Amino acid sequence: PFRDARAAPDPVLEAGPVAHGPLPVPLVLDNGSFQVRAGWACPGQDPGPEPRLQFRAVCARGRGGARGASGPQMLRSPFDRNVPVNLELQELLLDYSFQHLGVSSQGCVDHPIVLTEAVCNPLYSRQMMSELLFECYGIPKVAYGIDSLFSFYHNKPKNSMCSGLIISSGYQCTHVLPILEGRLDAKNCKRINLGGSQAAGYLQRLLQLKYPGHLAAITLSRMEEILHEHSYIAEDYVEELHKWRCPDYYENNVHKMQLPFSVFNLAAYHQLFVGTERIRAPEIIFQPSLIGEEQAGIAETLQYILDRYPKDIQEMLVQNVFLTGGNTMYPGMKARMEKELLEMRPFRSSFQVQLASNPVLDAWYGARDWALNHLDDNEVWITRKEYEEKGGEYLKEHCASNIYVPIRLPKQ
DNA sequence: TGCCGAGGCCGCTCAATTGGTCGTAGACAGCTCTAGCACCGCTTAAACGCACGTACGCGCTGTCCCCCGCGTTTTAACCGCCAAGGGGATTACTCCCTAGTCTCCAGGCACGTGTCAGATATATACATCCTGTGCATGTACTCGGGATATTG
Numbered sequence: 262p263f264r265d266a267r268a269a270p271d272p273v274l275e276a277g278p279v280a281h282g283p284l285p286v287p288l289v290l291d292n293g294s295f296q297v298r299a300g301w302a303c304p305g306q307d308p309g310p311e312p313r314l315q316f317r318a319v320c321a322r323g324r325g326g327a328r329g330a331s332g333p334q335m336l337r338s339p340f341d342r343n344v345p346v347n348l349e350l351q352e353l354l355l356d357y358s359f360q361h362l363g364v365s366s367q368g369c370v371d372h373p374i375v376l377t378e379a380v381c382n383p384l385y386s387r388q389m390m391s392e393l394l395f396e397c398y399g400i401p402k403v404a405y406g407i408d409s410l411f412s413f414y415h416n417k418p419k420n421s422m423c424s425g426l427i428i429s430s431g432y433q434c435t436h437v438l439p440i441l442e443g444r445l446d447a448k449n450c451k452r453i454n455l456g457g458s459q460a461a462g463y464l465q466r467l468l469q470l471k472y473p474g475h476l477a478a479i480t481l482s483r484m485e486e487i488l489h490e491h492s493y494i495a496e497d498y499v500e501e502l503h504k505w506r507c508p509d510y511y512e513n514n515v516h517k518m519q520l521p522f523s524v525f526n527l528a529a530y531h532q533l534f535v536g537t538e539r540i541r542a543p544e545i546i547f548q549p550s551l552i553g554e555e556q557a558g559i560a561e562t563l564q565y566i567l568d569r570y571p572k573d574i575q576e577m578l579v580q581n582v583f584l585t586g587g588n589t590m591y592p593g594m595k596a597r598m599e600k601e602l603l604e605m606r607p608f609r610s611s612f613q614v615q616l617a618s619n620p621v622l623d624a625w626y627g628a629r630d631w632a633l634n635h636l637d638d639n640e641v642w643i644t645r646k647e648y649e650e651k652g653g654e655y656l657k658e659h660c661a662s663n664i665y666v667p668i669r670l671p672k673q
Numbered sequence: 674t675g676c677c678g679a680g681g682c683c684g685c686t687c688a689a690t691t692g693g694t695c696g697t698a699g700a701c702a703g704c705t706c707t708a709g710c711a712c713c714g715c716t717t718a719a720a721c722g723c724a725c726g727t728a729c730g731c732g733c734t735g736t737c738c739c740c741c742g743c744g745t746t747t748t749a750a751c752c753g754c755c756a757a758g759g760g761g762a763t764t765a766c767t768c769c770c771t772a773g774t775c776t777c778c779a780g781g782c783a784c785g786t787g788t789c790a791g792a793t794a795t796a797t798a799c800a801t802c803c804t805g806t807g808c809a810t811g812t813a814c815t816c817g818g819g820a821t822a823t824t825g
């Protein structure tokens with residue numbers, strides 16, 4: 262039976278939890294598309310004690326017009342396909358986050374910040390995100406990095422130079438990232454235009470067509486439960502669906518999702534039987550052709566990037582296949598990935614598949630551990646004055662960050 | 674009996690359709706126009722469409738309560754028929770008049786340009802006309818009783 266989600270927690274703090282040693286403790290801000298995750302670096306403690314503000318990245322303002330609201334509670338959100346592209350709907354998302362974390366007082370946030378961004382970020386987008394940050398909030402110095410690569414940095418066996426493929430899958434994108442000597446080989450990195458949002462959207466539209474008698478009973482927040490709790494990824498889809506074909510297996514494995522009641526009441530207050538549907542929603546990232554979409558999918562793409570290298574460095578970078586982010590949470594994901602990988606390697610060769618320690622939070626914990634180390638490496642950060650000579654389309658090439666290129670944007 | 678008378682099958686000859694072959698004449702497809710002026714691309718400052726609670730108007734709804742429907746059959750002539758008669762619609766011919774062709778011939782006017790005006794649009798101020806509302810009676814109605822008209 263379905264549950265309902267929680268809302269409106271009580272995060273309130275003093276003006277700044279400044280510890281011993283250096284006073285400018287940075288904010289660690291994972292600016293996610295599904296949800297934002299934000300908090301103080303809190304140095305000198307091994308386990309990250311409190312990743313506060315776990316909240317959905319969505320805002321309310323309706324037919325009333327005169328007000329808007331920002332916490333977990335018609336709706337809007339600041340992103341287009343995992344790049345932020347909104348003005349004040351970004352501000353009132355930052356404002357919520359700062360106010361609930363506490364801030365000093367004066368006409369700026371006194372603390373430096375580390376902020377996640379898109380695997381590639383359009384130059385205009387980076388420029389705007391820098392302007393909307395330095396101008397309005399007055400931050401002293403800033404760092405941009407990629408969610409996935411922070412999660413890798415967290416999960417590495419050692420704080421040392423590495424190579425691998427990162428497999429990442431968030432709200433509206435999945436990416437395959439080849440990395441060599443700690444550097445993202447962004448020349449031949451690739452992404453797929455699908456993700457967990459689109460899975461839920463498909464599972465919704467399926468069950469709407471299965472039970473037209475009660476369109477209103479099924480809605481995204483209930484699709485979330487069946488997709489998180491009750492769905493799994495096949496080892497081989499055309500074989501799973503084949504064992505699902507016989508009634509004696511079906512009845513033993515179909516999921517009985519009881520709606521809340523007011524004929525045994527199921528003619529409207531149905532038990533929403535999900536069978537094959539609990540496979541067809543996860544599978545979208547491996548076979549986007551279950552939707553209309555003609556793209557290679559996470560299987561053909563991995564082969565298509567992996568055959569663009571010399572045969573020795575393939576055998577190097579496949580030694581660390583890493584799973585992180587959103588959709589990798591499905592049960593069975595490691596097994597499907599390592600089976601699909603076994604067919605596309607030399608007959609006796611070796612590979613290894615690692616799953617992130619906490620697939621959803623390790624991006625933030627990574628950004629924490631990174632900033633807490635690189636406090637004083639002033640070649641890594643963008644300082645407030647640099648933004649006055651370099652127009653905002655500028656970045657500092659540390660590991661776990663997008664590849665910079667010399668370029669400039671006309672503005673007046 | 675008879676005879677034959679009446680009787681039942683098969684090549685000429687003509688008269689539409691049908692399809693074929695002859696040759697020749699504009700009219701169709703196409704080219705090059707060429708030429709130019711519309712389509713487009715490129716900006717601009719622009720109007721008007723459109724996605725979106727809430728007051729709330731009325732579309733739809735649960736009751737009882739009766740005529741007109743619903744059912745029958747007698748009959749009543751309506752409608753159908755067939756057969757006969759008369760002509761008038763029809764057919765086939767001969768004489769006849771003009772429909773149609775072409776050709777010459779003119780100027781009527783429909784065509785076209787050449788200028789630029791009285792026209793009507795658009796704004797601002799505005800007063801006024803017109804709508805929506807609220808509000809008495811006056812009639813057009815439904816009924817009952819009797820006179821006149823008309824059917825059988």
Ligand SMILES: Nc1ncnc2c1ncn2[C@@H]1O[C@H](COP(=O)(O)OP(=O)(O)O)[C@@H](O)[C@H]1O
Pocket residue numbers: 292293294295296343408430431432433456457458461488489490586587588590591621
């Ligand atoms: N436990 C889970 N099982 C399955 N899917 C999950 C789970 N938790 C989150 N997701 C999916 O993860 C996606 C969001 O992941 P996230 O890393 O926050 O995205 P991003 O970094 O792009 O904002 C959502 O589409 C959601 O459906």
